[PDB]
Amino acid sequence: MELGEFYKELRLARKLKQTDVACEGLTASQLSKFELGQSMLSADKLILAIQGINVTFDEFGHKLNNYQESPHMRIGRKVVNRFAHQDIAALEQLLEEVDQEQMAQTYRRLNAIVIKDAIHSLNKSYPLAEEDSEFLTTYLYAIESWTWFELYLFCNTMPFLSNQDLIFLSTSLLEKSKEFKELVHNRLYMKQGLLNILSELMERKLFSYIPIFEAELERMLRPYDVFEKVSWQFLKKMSVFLQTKGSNQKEIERFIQSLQVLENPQLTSLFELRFQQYKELID
């Protein structure tokens, strides 16, 4: 019930004594009064207590929420997943689900815009509204430090931005994401966003802006990041393709075939699909 009572259960599960957690600034008696619900720890002492039981902040928050992710992350991940599966029916159900969930009016409006944008991306006959596009853009400009929620909004509404806003917000992404850039969820979305920026710039023929975002992707990618590395390799070839009337078509075809070594039929189809789509951009 109380935070101290919640913390105490966690400490006992970690099989730690109060003296194991205690350190400079946080005494066992302070931890005891905290666990008894008779006093609250300061912000600095609270972070010591949580680090003292050796659980990640994601784990601490997960158990605090009864082993559910935060509502805004549950919605955003489901939207991304269902859009990636071209699941119009599930997106339409998410729209009514967002309308029935308890959240700030601003967040209800932003989630509806992303979902409606996704449905329109699958079904171009699904109507949109300019007032919604302006509301989301105004929001991204207003938030000074972009959390996972802003990365989710930006990454999935880029096709809908004017060139002016795409260029400015993509440039601002570099600075505005720095506060939370090291976190596991955020860094994954940053790499995916950078790949989507590269795609958008090519499709819009804004080729001169690509190097700024390739340099950022270069700094972020680790040897583990095989999927993003191969995606970037493919997009470098697509940029040449779109700038030279398809001159490197055979090289791209050979590259996709060589991905058979990965024995990943879904991945091969993904690149084959994008290649066929980009072929429609040249005469």
Which residues within the stretch 167-226 sit at the binding site for its own copies (CB under 8 A)? 179-180, 182-186, 188, 223-226
Residue 188: CB minimum distance to its own copies, A = 8
Residue 32's contacts (CB-CB under 8 Å, 6 or more residues apart) are: 18
Within 10 Å of residue 266's Cβ, how many Cβ atoms?
6
Residue from the set 100, 125, 208, 266 that interacts with its own copies by CB under 8 A = 266
Residue from the set 126, 135, 168, 227 that interacts with its own copies by CB under 8 A = 227
- In the shown chain, the binding pattern of residues 86 to 125 toward its own copies, with x for contact by CB under 8 A and - for none, equals ----------------xxxxxx------------------
With beta carbons less than 8 A apart as the criterion, state whether 196 and 156 touch. no
Contacts to its own copies from residues 56-85, by CB under 8 A = 56-65, 67, 69-73
Residue 116: CB minimum distance to its own copies, A = 19
Contacts to its own copies from residues 240-259, by CB under 8 A = 255, 258-259
Contacts to its own copies from residues 18-47, by CB under 8 A = 20-21, 23-24, 40-44, 46-47
Residue 267 is encoded by which pair of tokens? 């991945």
User: Across the strands, what pairs with 161?
Assistant: none
Distance CA 247, CA 177 (A): 37
In total, the chain counts a number of residues equal to: 283
Residue 27: CB minimum distance to its own copies, A = 13
Residue 172 is encoded by which pair of tokens? 């601002």
- Terminal-to-terminal C-alpha distance of the chain: 65
Residue from the set 16, 95, 206, 220 that interacts with its own copies by CB under 8 A = 16
Number of residues that bind its own copies (CB under 8 A): 79
Question: HSE of 176 in the Cβ direction (CA atoms, 13 Å)?
Answer: 19
19: amino acid identity, one letter: T
